[PDB]
Amino acid sequence: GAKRHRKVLRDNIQGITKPAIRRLARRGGVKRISGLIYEETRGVLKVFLENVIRDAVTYTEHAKRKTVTAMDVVYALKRQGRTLYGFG
Amino acid sequence: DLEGTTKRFEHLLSLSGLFKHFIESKADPKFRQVLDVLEENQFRESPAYVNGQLRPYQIQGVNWLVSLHKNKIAGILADEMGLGKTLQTISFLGYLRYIEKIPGPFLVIAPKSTLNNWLREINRWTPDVNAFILQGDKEERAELIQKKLLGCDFDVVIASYEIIIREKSPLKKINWEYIIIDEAHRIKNEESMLSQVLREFTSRNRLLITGTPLQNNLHELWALLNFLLPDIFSDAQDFDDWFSSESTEEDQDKIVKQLHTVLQPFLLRRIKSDVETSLLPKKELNLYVGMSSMQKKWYKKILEKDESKTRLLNIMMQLRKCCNHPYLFDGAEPGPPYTTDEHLVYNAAKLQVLDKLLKKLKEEGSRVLIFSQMSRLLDILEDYCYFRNYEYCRIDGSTAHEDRIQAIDDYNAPDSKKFVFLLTTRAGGLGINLTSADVVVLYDSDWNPQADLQAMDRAHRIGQKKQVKVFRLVTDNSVEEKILERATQKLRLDQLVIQQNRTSNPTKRER
Amino acid sequence: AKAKTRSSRAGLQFPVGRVHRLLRKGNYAERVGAGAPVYLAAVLEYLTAEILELAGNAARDNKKTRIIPRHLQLAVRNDEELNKLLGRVTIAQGGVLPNIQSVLLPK
Amino acid sequence: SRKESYAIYVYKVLKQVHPDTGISSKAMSIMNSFVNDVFERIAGEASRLAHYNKRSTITSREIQTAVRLLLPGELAKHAVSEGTKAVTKYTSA
Amino acid sequence: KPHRYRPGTVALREIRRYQKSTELLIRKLPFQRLVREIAQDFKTDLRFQSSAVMALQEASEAYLVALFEDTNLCAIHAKRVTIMPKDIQLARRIRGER
Numbered sequence: 001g002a003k004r005h006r007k008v009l010r011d012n013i014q015g016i017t018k019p020a021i022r023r024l025a026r027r028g029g030v031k032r033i034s035g036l037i038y039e040e041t042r043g044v045l046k047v048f049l050e051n052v053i054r055d056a057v058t059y060t061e062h063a064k065r066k067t068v069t070a071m072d073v074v075y076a077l078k079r080q081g082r083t084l085y086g087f088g
Numbered sequence: 089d090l091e092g093t094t095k096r097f098e099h100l101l102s103l104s105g106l107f108k109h110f111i112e113s114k115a116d117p118k119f120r121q122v123l124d125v126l127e128e129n130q131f132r133e134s135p136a137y138v139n140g141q142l143r144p145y146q147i148q149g150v151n152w153l154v155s156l157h158k159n160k161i162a163g164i165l166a167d168e169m170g171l172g173k174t175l176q177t178i179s180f181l182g183y184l185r186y187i188e189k190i191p192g193p194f195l196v197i198a199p200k201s202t203l204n205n206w207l208r209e210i211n212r213w214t215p216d217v218n219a220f221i222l223q224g225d226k227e228e229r230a231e232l233i234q235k236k237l238l239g240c241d242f243d244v245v246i247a248s249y250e251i252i253i254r255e256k257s258p259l260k261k262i263n264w265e266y267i268i269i270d271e272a273h274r275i276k277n278e279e280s281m282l283s284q285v286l287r288e289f290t291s292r293n294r295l296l297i298t299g300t301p302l303q304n305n306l307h308e309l310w311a312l313l314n315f316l317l318p319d320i321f322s323d324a325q326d327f328d329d330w331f332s333s334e335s336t337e338e339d340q341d342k343i344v345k346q347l348h349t350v351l352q353p354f355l356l357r358r359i360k361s362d363v364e365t366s367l368l369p370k371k372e373l374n375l376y377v378g379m380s381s382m383q384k385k386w387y388k389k390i391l392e393k394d395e396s397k398t399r400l401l402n403i404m405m406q407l408r409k410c411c412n413h414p415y416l417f418d419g420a421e422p423g424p425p426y427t428t429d430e431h432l433v434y435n436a437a438k439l440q441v442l443d444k445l446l447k448k449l450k451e452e453g454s455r456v457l458i459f460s461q462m463s464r465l466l467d468i469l470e471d472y473c474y475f476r477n478y479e480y481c482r483i484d485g486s487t488a489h490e491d492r493i494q495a496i497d498d499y500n501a502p503d504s505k506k507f508v509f510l511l512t513t514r515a516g517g518l519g520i521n522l523t524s525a526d527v528v529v530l531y532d533s534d535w536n537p538q539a540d541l542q543a544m545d546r547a548h549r550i551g552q553k554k555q556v557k558v559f560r561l562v563t564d565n566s567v568e569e570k571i572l573e574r575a576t577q578k579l580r581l582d583q584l585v586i587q588q589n590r591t592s593n594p595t596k597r598e599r
Numbered sequence: 600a601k602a603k604t605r606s607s608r609a610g611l612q613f614p615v616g617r618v619h620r621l622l623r624k625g626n627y628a629e630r631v632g633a634g635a636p637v638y639l640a641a642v643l644e645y646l647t648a649e650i651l652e653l654a655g656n657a658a659r660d661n662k663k664t665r666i667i668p669r670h671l672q673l674a675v676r677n678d679e680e681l682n683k684l685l686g687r688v689t690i691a692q693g694g695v696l697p698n699i700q701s702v703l704l705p706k
Numbered sequence: 707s708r709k710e711s712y713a714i715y716v717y718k719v720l721k722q723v724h725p726d727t728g729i730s731s732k733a734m735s736i737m738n739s740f741v742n743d744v745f746e747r748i749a750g751e752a753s754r755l756a757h758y759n760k761r762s763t764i765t766s767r768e769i770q771t772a773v774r775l776l777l778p779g780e781l782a783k784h785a786v787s788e789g790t791k792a793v794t795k796y797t798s799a
Numbered sequence: 800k801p802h803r804y805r806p807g808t809v810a811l812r813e814i815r816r817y818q819k820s821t822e823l824l825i826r827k828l829p830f831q832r833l834v835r836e837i838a839q840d841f842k843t844d845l846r847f848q849s850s851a852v853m854a855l856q857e858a859s860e861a862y863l864v865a866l867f868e869d870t871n872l873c874a875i876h877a878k879r880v881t882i883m884p885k886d887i888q889l890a891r892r893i894r895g896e897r
């Protein structure tokens with residue numbers, strides 16, 4: 001018994017896994033990796049994310065919706081001067 | 089093909105002139121060429137190659153089945169569940185094996201929980217047929233492919249819902265005799281991927297089988313029906329507006345007779361109540377219990393959005409889980425040691441009545457089955473089963489293949505002390521027999537009443553030697569009340585026609 | 600007379616009437632010259648072909664018949680002019696130019 | 707709903723350069739993506755210059771200079787010719 | 800005796816693989832819930848488009864990718880072959896991103 005509560009430890013941010021991280025680094029061209037990188041990366045990626053996400057959400061309400069659109073986030077990207085092609 | 093197509097109409101056109109009407113209602117290939125020329129111009133002894141006795145309706149179904157074969161027309165063995173319809177099929181496969189002497193390639197499909205039973209019953213009754221449980225891994229399925237399946241060293245093959253989709257390509261190259269489809273409920277959706285994998289195989293006959301008939305709609309009815317004889321209908325909305333949904337506008341309820349008259353000589357229903365074979369009905373009680381006062385805090389916290397700062401993207405399920413069990417909301421159990429005691433049954437609305445009924449049924453010797461929707465909730469029941477120290481076996485969605493068999497065997501073992509039996513709803517009760525059990529209880533209600541009917545009759549089949557005492561759990565003053573009423577709504581829109589078919593901040597700068 | 604498209608009149612392929620409308624609703628000025636929709640529209644053809652021709656070249660170098668963003672990624676990023684032009688452009692699914700650092704090469 | 711885009715014209719130009727090469731759809735969307743961008747960047751740049759000299763109407767003088775401002779080096783050099791050739795062709799035609 | 804490669808030869812092989820590959824390296828299910836996690840601190844209870852859900856990753860990766868290769872430049876200049884966070888932070892500071 002007492003197994004209904006045995007796995008409550010998700011805490012999303014590790015969901016970006018070390019194998020992927022190195023897989024990411026391997027595509028980038030890094031040959032060998034410190035172990036503290038993985039965690040430090042988690043910080044860099046997240047802090048990146050909301051700033052757009054904030055801006056990305058920042059649009060949504062102004063047009064009085066409740067469902068985030070790619071075009072919305074498309075504009076979100078442009079404002080910081082990193083433009084993307086391919087989602088209209 | 090066309091000779092059979094002419095020969096199919098030899099039996100199709102012998103019915104009412106409605107088939108000519110449907111052929112002439114197409115808005116047309118050369119089916120008219122063979123229609124115009126026609127327009128202007130056994131084994132009732134329970135054959136003993138089986139090892140046992142066939143029931144009288146069983147023979148009739150088989151004789152009805154052999155007629156469809158001799159007619160070269162298709163159909164659906166729609167006999168009510170637990171009427172030994174597996175024996176009817178096993179006898180029918182013997183009918184082809186011995187009378188016509190064509191032991192050939194056969195394909196049968198069963199839910200994951202049920203592949204054991206069909207192999208078990210085929211061995212018990214007609215041991216002369218080569219069948220496999222096509223289970224195992226990607227490599228473990230391969231040596232079945234090249235060695236025996238590619239070697240044509242078999243008669244029937246027993247696979248699951250997904251395996252055939254996993255094995256579509258190695259199965260196309262083998263032409264079949266029937267595609268035997270048990271519990272044909274995934275086919276209700278045309279876009280259900282299993283439908284597009286089955287319209288691609290080439291078998292001379294296509295024997296669809298079910299435990300319950302159509303669930304909700306006429307659209308669904310010809311969804312089963314369109315794959316039966318596809319070259320004949322080849323139409324989707326043509327069939328629908330032809331019958332116009334039980335006269336949804338005029339409510340004549342007399343054009344339904346035309347629906348019944350085509351399907352009565354095209355399809356077969358038998359019910360348990362008519363030919364008992366068990367001579368004992370089942371009881372039903374709906375244990376309306378009040379929703380627990382302790383969780384009333386969180387239930388209000390869900391209604392008023394008071395615990396906080398989470399999703400409510402499906403308020404349906406959120407209230408459903410609170411209607412089901414409070415500790416499911418990730419914090420209703422505050423204990424860092426996660427105490428396991430009477431507080432669980434205390435804080436829960438249902439388990440108090442469950443604890444009472446478990447104590448009663450323990451003394452009465454009632455061998456109970458429990459069905460539920462949430463596998464996570466079953467963990468708590470598994471924990472609470474540990475609290476009461478009952479023997480049992482937990483089958484859940486994707487536990488194992490051999491574990492399903494062994495847990496079933498231990499529960500159905502003679503004089504099995506496994507007093508309770510944890511089981512899911514959509515993974516557990518789709519064809520297995522549990523005659524060792526008598527009483528079956530639902531923890532929660534499902535938005536599919538025929539599935540509710542499908543699940544309940546697990547213990548109430550041929551071989552049930554006690555009175556089936558159903559105790560459905562419905563929460564008082566809850567949203568579960570509306571689901572059951574809606575469950576009744578979908579029930580009565582369907583039962584009414586089926587019964588006719590059989591009969592006929594500011595200034596705070598950080599700086 | 601006989602209707603004759605301006606793009607034909609310039610001997611161009613790009614729809615100038617579309618843009619003169621678009622310039623008109625684009626609120627870039629309250630009045631707009633006539634050859635400006637024209638003037639840009641041809642140069643529009645120039646760069647697409649310029650990239651498309653590069654897109655064709657790389658497409659051949661893997662011996663495919665249909666152009667993909669990886670090709671597009673390769674082409675522009677292989678072009679120092681385009682890459683300088685599109686430095687703030689990131690390409691969907693485009694991938695990266697294969698390039699390993701000299702010191703990562705083994706002795 | 708109606709949606710207007712640039713695929714057909716891009717498709718025509720491709721068959722000008724590579725009359726045999728095919729094309730995906732996503733990359734075509736990229737092309738639609740790309741064209742609109744440079745479409746935008748020139749125009750507002752074109753607008754603000756007319757603002758800088760306080761004029762009210764945008765002609766090729768406006769368009770060309772920003773093309774020189776926007777395109778680097780050889781593209782600007784070559785494309786101005788591409789612009790220059792068409793304009794005279796239009797005025798003559 | 801086991802045939803183990805010299806450490807790094809595998810990595811150079813890996814480095815090659817992905818530099819021709821073009822696909823994502825981040826699992827979708829972990830990925831989107833991250834965003835669904837994040838949205839709460841701005842507005843409760845939004846509803847995401849997969850296209851948007853997809854579109855996040857490309858920026859997510861492309862950003863982090865360009866980070867890596869710059870960070871790779873660091874240890875080389877720092878006469879290393881193993882990357883340190885001090886490299887990573889350094890670029891972002893050189894990127895002027897702290």
Ligand SMILES: Nc1ncnc2c1ncn2[C@@H]1O[C@H](COP(=O)(O)OP(=O)(O)O)[C@@H](O)[C@H]1O
Pocket residue numbers: 140141142143146168169170171172173174175519521549550551
């Ligand atoms: N004529 C018969 N003779 C002996 N046993 C039967 C007969 N009909 C049904 N049974 C028993 O009743 C049970 C019903 O199982 P099955 O035939 O699989 O029904 P279903 O196919 O509807 O699930 C079987 O285990 C079978 O042994």
Ligand code: BEF
Pocket residue numbers: 168169170171271298299518519520521
């Ligand atoms: F009645 Be059968 F087991 F589906």
Ligand SMILES: [Mg+2]
Pocket residue numbers: 170171172173174175176
């Ligand atoms: Mg049966």
